[PDB]
Structure formats: C-alpha cells, structure tokens
From Swiss-Prot:
The name this protein goes by in its record: Eukaryotic translation initiation factor 4E
GO molecular function, one term: enzyme binding
Organismal lineage: Eukaryota, Metazoa, Chordata, Craniata, Vertebrata
Effect of residue 43 to A: Binding to CYFIP1 reduced by 70%. Does not affect mRNA nuclear export or nuclear pore complex reprogramming. Does not affect affinity for mRNA cap. Reduces interaction with LRPPRC. Reduces affinity for PML and viral Z protein
Quaternary structure and interacting proteins, as annotated: eIF4F is a multi-subunit complex, the composition of which varies with external and internal environmental conditions. It is composed of at least EIF4A, EIF4E and EIF4G1/EIF4G3. EIF4E is also known to interact with other partners. Interacts with EIF4ENIF1/4E-T; promotes recruitment to P-bodies and import into the nucleus.
Source organism: Mus musculus
Gene name tied to this protein: Eif4e
Keywords in alphabetical order: Acetylation, Cytoplasm, Initiation factor, mRNA transport, Nucleus, Phosphoprotein, Protein biosynthesis, RNA-binding, Translation regulation, Transport
Family: Belongs to the eukaryotic initiation factor 4E family.
Length: 181
C-alpha cells in the first residue's frame, strides 16, 4: 500500500496570505489560500506559490493548524506568543527562504516531540525594514513547552549559539521578551 497512498500528516494545515492594502482593515487583508493534510499535497502547494523572498513588501504567509486563524484573537492564540526571528535586509537573500521552509517542515513534521501540540502555526512577514519569521504557540505561561520549542527551533534553523532569539506574548505585542534561548 506504500505504493499508491499519499502520506497523511499528523495535522491538516491551512496556508494564508496577507497583502497590505491601506483601503482595508487588517483582518480584511488576510485570506485563506488552501488547505492540505498529506506530504504530497504540501509540496504541490509549496511548488506552486511564490518564494517569500519574491513577495512584495507588506505581504505575509501564515501556516496554521486547521481551525486556528493566524491572528491574536483566535481562542488558541489569545494566551500564547511567538518565537521571533528577525532578519536584516541582507538575510532576505541569504536565509529568508531556507528559514521559512525549515519552519514549514518543523510544523508539518511535528518536530517538537510532546510539545508539538502547543504549536499553532508560523508566520513570515516580508517587510522593507526587515523581515520576520515566527512560530506561534498556544500558551505563553507553559515555560516547559515554550523554551523547548524555542531550543529545538533555533537548532533546526542552524543559528549560532552566539545569537539569542526571544519569545513574546501576543498580549504584549498587541498593546519585551518573556523567554530567550
């Protein structure tokens, strides 16, 4: 049966796109692209869309578990936060696309062991002043889960142990770091 069945993923995922249009509210600029729940359907989608480095400034991609919208207000994000990766203008070229794909694989591959259930999704923001990639988790007070996801993520990204990344709550963002690894 390994011959003809697609490989189902642990979760079904939704990809979202955001395009900055000052005519519209922020929520109105957020749009679901499509969903998938197999490895094959993931790659069909990835191979079909623009690399993040080719997006116009002001655009975002978001990959979230089906039923979680990529906004702070979702029940699964209101008490959560994000591990934040900040990219200077030069890293748009060097690391943006490879960091984002690694992040996508950390999500769909459930790479954070027992704490993968705390993952909600990830977001890449393409911006003229500097890009951002982040993994969103559901509960910023679960120190074990947050710091563990943060350590795994930093290692999968290949970041030097010289560098530090930080985790901030969405509540703080909507109005500093809570954890660092």
């Amino acid at each position: 049966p390994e011959h003809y069945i697609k490989h189902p993923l642990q979760n079904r995922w939704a990809l979202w796109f955001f395009k900055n249009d000052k005519s519209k509210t922020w929520q109105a600029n957020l749009r679901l692209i499509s969903k998938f729940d197999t490895v094959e359907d993931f790659w069909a989608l990835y191979n079909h869309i623009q690399l993040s480095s080719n997006l116009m400034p002001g655009c975002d991609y978001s990959l979230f578990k089906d039923g979680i919208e990529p906004m702070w207000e979702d029940e699964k994000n209101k008490r959560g936060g994000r591990w934040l990766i900040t990219l200077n203008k030069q890293q748009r070229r060097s690391d943006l696309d490879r960091f984002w794909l690694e992040t996508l694989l950390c999500l769909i591959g459930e790479s954070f062991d027992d704490y993968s259930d705390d993952v909600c999704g990830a977001v890449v923001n393409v911006r003229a002043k500097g890009d951002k990639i982040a993994i969103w988790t559901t509960e910023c007070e679960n120190r074990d889960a947050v710091t563990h996801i943060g350590r795994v993520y930093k290692e999968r990204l290949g970041l030097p142990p010289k560098i530090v990344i930080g985790y901030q709550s969405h509540a703080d963002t909507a109005t500093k770091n809570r954890f660092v690894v």
